[PDB]
Amino acid sequence: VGSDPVILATAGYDHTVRFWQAHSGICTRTVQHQDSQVNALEVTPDRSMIAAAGYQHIRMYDLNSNNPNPIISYDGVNKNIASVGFHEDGRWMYTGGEDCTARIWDLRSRNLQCQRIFQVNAPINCVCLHPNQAELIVGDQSGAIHIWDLKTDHNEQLIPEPEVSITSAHIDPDASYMAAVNSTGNCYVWNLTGGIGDEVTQLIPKTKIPAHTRYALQCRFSPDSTLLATCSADQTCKIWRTSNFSLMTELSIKSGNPGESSRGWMWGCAFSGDSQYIVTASSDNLARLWCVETGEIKREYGGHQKAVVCLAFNDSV
Amino acid sequence: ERAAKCRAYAKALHYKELEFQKGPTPAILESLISINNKLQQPEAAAGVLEYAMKHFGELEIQATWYEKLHEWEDALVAYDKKMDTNKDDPELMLGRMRCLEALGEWGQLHQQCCEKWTLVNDETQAKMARMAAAAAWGLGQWDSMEEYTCMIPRDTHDGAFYRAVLALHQDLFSLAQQCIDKARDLLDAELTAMAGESYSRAYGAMVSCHMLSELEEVIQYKLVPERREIIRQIWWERLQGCQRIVEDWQKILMVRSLVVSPHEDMRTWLKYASLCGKSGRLALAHKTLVLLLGVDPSRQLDHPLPTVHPQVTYAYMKNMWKSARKIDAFQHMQHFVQTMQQQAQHAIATEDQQHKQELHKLMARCFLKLGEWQLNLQGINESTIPKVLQYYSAATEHDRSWYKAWHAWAVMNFEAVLHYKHQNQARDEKKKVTEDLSKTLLMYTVPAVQGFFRSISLSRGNNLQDTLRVLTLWFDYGHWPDVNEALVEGVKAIQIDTWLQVIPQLIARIDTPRPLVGRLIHQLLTDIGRYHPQALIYPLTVASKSTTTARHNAANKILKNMCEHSNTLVQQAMMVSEELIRVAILWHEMWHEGLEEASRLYFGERNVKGMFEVLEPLHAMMERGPQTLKETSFNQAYGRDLMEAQEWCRKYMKSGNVKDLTQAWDLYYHVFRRISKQLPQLTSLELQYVSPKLLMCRDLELAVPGTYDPNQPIIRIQSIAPSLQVITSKQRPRKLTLMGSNGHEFVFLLKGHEDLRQDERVMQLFGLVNTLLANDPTSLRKNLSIQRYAVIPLSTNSGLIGWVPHCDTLHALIRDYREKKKILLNIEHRIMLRMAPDYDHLTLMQKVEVFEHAVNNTAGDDLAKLLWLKSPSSEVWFDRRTNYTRSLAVMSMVGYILGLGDRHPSNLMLDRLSGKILHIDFGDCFEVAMTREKFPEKIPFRLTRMLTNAMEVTGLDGNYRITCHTVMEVLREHKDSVMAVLEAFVYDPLLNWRLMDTNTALNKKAIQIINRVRDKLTGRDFSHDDTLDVPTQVELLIKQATSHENLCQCYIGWCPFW
């Protein structure tokens, strides 16, 4: 269940973490995650374990050993943990809390507490780590985006749209663009200044896309850096191209009947390695595999009794 | 016949509203303002247009929307913008003109008509004439008028009217007399068509009918030489009386201008210009005064103002202040006063002693303005304090019997005291310091006390603020000889009536450790004993049984003194209150709570010394022996076990063995389980078993609780009903019912373990807020009030609450509907948990989804729908709704200022006959609900979905928002009164307990709370740095009250989805 080349993992409100085999739709294994909903899932770079960010905990289940329960729990923080993020050399794990802290955890050490804390003012919705592994972009509920320099401990902050909660932020593998998405439904894009060797990292604003009318819940860059996907409460995943910032493909789960209640929010997406496909987390209890070029529904992953709020997807050799 | 006419509309509207529910079109929206207008409901229709703007910019020239809103000044400078971009458009030109006629800008309306005359087509020309006639009338160009009147047909009521005016300039009477009677019937038959203008010309037919009766009064004036004073009087009475807006009153005075010039009629035209100023049409107010001065638009701007007519100048000056030019206004005032005193002192030959007096009154008003303005420009500081006090004391001299004057002087001294105190707290953050301060504070304290006393006697009925201020100075500083002297002096002078108003605040200081302050309090209360003892016996009786010793001593000293004139009233009050506390919590219920507590301390906390402190008053209570049949029947079935349970407890006291103490608890739990089983077997109590002394009570001289007021004959307790229904809460209130000596019955909730002291002062605050709403004309026009009820504390635990008739809790009404409609009562909750079993632990984002899911799968219409089915006709349905919307908005705003938390659906109710709203339970006050640890409130008041639904469609834009503004405007104006009342309880020594519960000195904490309130009452309650005006702050609040992100966070019991 880590020996398989593709890792596709789904969690939400039904107290399970389910693993799927991507090319069939068959559920490989389920893992018991009781006493909380799962807020975020991330597979470690080295594919050794998966992390489940929840309420006042991060639980970490093994991918190499099939069947046991969690290897590592992290406790003693209060309110929700909203984002997980890992450093490439697999030692550092990053979290964003409702408790207004960015927390760096030593994974190769035994302390139940964390190495460093960056405290802000609002609850933190998302944490992501610049490809250079030297900066943590931290987005909070006040609408501030903090660039935390993990070397200097200097912080720098930036507010695109004031008083509006920023909901997710991401940064393309090549590190040319940074996207942030807010509760208005806008997507802000910034260009990146490669003064990386001496520590500068400037952000020069490029676009505000009016991505959606409802809450934007996640944004993610294709590994290609060709595309930026955007997930929303408007029951949609919108894939934008990075050349025009025009819409390329829209994936939706609307009723096709104006009197059906909203049948689920689009909580998350992950692109495939080749950037050919995208995976989708939804409140209708299904994960979905889509063709990115066509917007065709290639597969449906149907096991959870309650909602799905999380994905983790993995292609690595 | 006319009765049955509105019923048809009211019913048609209900469906027409439910049609808007089905699909909001411009087709419904149009046919909804119309029906709302005919239903003489103007502000609810105003809201329909607000929706029409905010959704359908489709009858939009932005200047047609500004036109429909009667916002003529914006519409004019928008029609300018639209015209100079486009061509001449005969539609925009008429639009541009309609603004200028409703602004009363005759100067330009006549100009812009003559500036474009080839461009008047026979359609454009017909409309053109009507307006260019009034424009000529407004400029006394009777030649221009007649030429334009010869253009308007004799068939239009407008045409026939302008003929009446022109004959009256030319003194043709029987001509004009006919023209009036014909202009009537050409408007009588006009309003039968009802499609031209259905209310702005129906209320504006009342403009015309007024004008046509006034024109018939003008025909009398120019023809009867003895009705001069009589007609002018009815002209003057129906002016302070009559309320018709600016625009209408231009026209009304234009009628009278035929007969009386402004110079002979100054008091009329100044009052008019006063109103133009009051409503904010300053450039018009100016032009009126300019005319009255006989000089000066601000043209010779560097020169002195003319004293020529001292009255007119004074108005001009405050107009100038109300404009921008306010350094200028201050300067002209300083100098104006200097002139006035010299035109008094030296120009007074003794014959002119009326003119001296009216002139002296004017100056007092100027002196007050000077003080007021100085503060506005400079603030309170070392250099301004003696200057304003100088102006204020000056004002004191010139009108010795002016409330405002004495008030302002008192306040200024009081704020002078505060300025130095707050300066000294500032000094200490960073010997002779105290000594100078002693002399500095005393310097201003004694005057403040005097001032507040003279102002109190100049109010009488309306002086809560001034009275409370007097107590602040008294309790704070009234132990310094000088201050005390002033107080003693004042106390003698002022009527005794005064203090009733303030009785709970006084009793709260019965035990004052300061000796000089104590004396005077006891002295005063004894005198308030002598005259009207009823107003003291309940509260003194409470005080006389008090664990704090010095309280009960000093209470009894007064009751001793009261016996020497009112003995058997004191004795009655003593006894009735004793028996009520007995009935409030029965012997077994006392034992129930005391065994929850003792089991928490010992088993759950390892504390025997605490446990012993709990049980010892209960054992010692029974040591006195049973006093009622219910006390025996308990003592029978349990007493044996308890006496022996205490035995084992005292064996442990001398041994230390846990085995001596487990045999005690073995006995304790026997009775505890036994009680618990019998507990919901108390649904009634009988007075013959529970308190015989009360059943016995016949024809007492003690008043029915909280019914005493000195204006009205005393309703005494004639007899008590022998049965008490026990409402089955966890608190278990009894429904007590007394027969009054007046015939009527009086129902109360007798409550155990519920500190009612808080609700008591809150009820007081509503009283004041009620006064201010009865006092503000608009608020009176709309019957805005708080439903209040009697609150009579009886001790720390217990007390009585007035039972308001015809009310059911929100919850009750919903429960009843959902069962009748076979909907599961708790459906949203069950929906929510089905979707998300961990609902309470979700991120805000996740929570909103589940909340929204619940709302979207349930009807929001319950309360709206039940309120419709309840009503015996549709016009009764409509009024009940008007009442509802209004009364709910009142408590939204007041609630917000008070910080009233915990407004769950059992804590507000609806009177089923009037439709008005009632709040109960004033436990959570100030930010308390929001500051808590588990489930904090994010809501400033409940503006929950079913509440919104139950309004009109367009509700929040309609009556709700308009009422909100009105109430808030009243509050902001009267902030000082409201602050006096709140400060009174925030700094109340016995009530500070409500804010240390933030754990699950206080000096510091108290200050915060009051700042927070001051902030709210000045619109500094969102951004520290911005100062928000009313409609903005209200809008922010409605936004906040309504935020799904907020509502989803409410503890589920609060029912965010209701």
From Swiss-Prot, chain A:
Start and stop residues of the WD repeats: 1-30, 33-73, 76-115, 119-158, 161-200, 211-250, 261-302
What SMART domains does the annotation carry?
Answer: WD40 (SM00320)
Q: Which residues carry this modification: Phosphothreonine?
A: 44
Q: Where is this cross-link: Glycyl lysine isopeptide (Lys-Gly) (interchain with G-Cter in SUMO3)?
A: 79, 208, 238, 254, 298
Kindly give the CDD domains that the UniProt entry links to this protein: WD40 (cd00200)
Show the cross-link location (Glycyl lysine isopeptide (Lys-Gly) (interchain with G-Cter in SUMO1)).
306
Task: Tell me which Gene Ontology terms the entry assigns under biological process.
Answer: cellular response to hypoxia; cellular response to nutrient levels; cellular response to osmotic stress; cytoskeleton organization; DNA damage response; negative regulation of apoptotic process; negative regulation of autophagy; positive regulation of actin filament polymerization
Report the sequence similarity comment from the record.
Belongs to the WD repeat LST8 family.
Q: Please identify the protein, giving its name as recorded.
A: Target of rapamycin complex subunit LST8
UniProt organism field: Homo sapiens
Curated annotation (Swiss-Prot), chain B:
Where does the record place the region Activation loop? 919-944
Q: Region Catalytic loop: what ranges? A: 899-907
Post-translational changes noted in the entry: Autophosphorylates when part of mTORC1 or mTORC2. Phosphorylation in the kinase domain modulates the interactions of MTOR with RPTOR and AKT1S1/PRAS40 and leads to increased intrinsic mTORC1 kinase activity. Phosphorylation at Ser-723 by TBK1 in response to growth factors and pathogen recognition receptors promotes mTORC1 activity. Phosphorylation at Ser-723 by TBK1 in response to EGF growth factor promotes mTORC2 activity, leading to AKT1 phosphorylation and activation. Ubiquitinated at Lys-630 by the SCF(FBXO22) complex via 'Lys-27'-linked ubiquitination prevents mTORC1 substrate recruitment.
Q: What tissue specificity does the UniProt entry give?
A: Expressed in numerous tissues, with highest levels in testis.
**Impact of changing residue 66 to D on the protein?**
In FCORD2; somatic mutation
Give residue ranges for domain FAT.
1-546
At which residues is Phosphothreonine found?
A: 728, 737
Q: Where is this region: Sufficient for interaction with the FKBP1A/rapamycin complex?
A: 576-708
Q: Summarize the impact of residue 737 to A.
A: Increased mTOR kinase activity
Record-given protein name: Serine/threonine-protein kinase mTOR
Species this protein is from:
Homo sapiens (Human)
What are the top taxonomic ranks of the organism? Eukaryota, Metazoa, Chordata, Craniata, Vertebrata
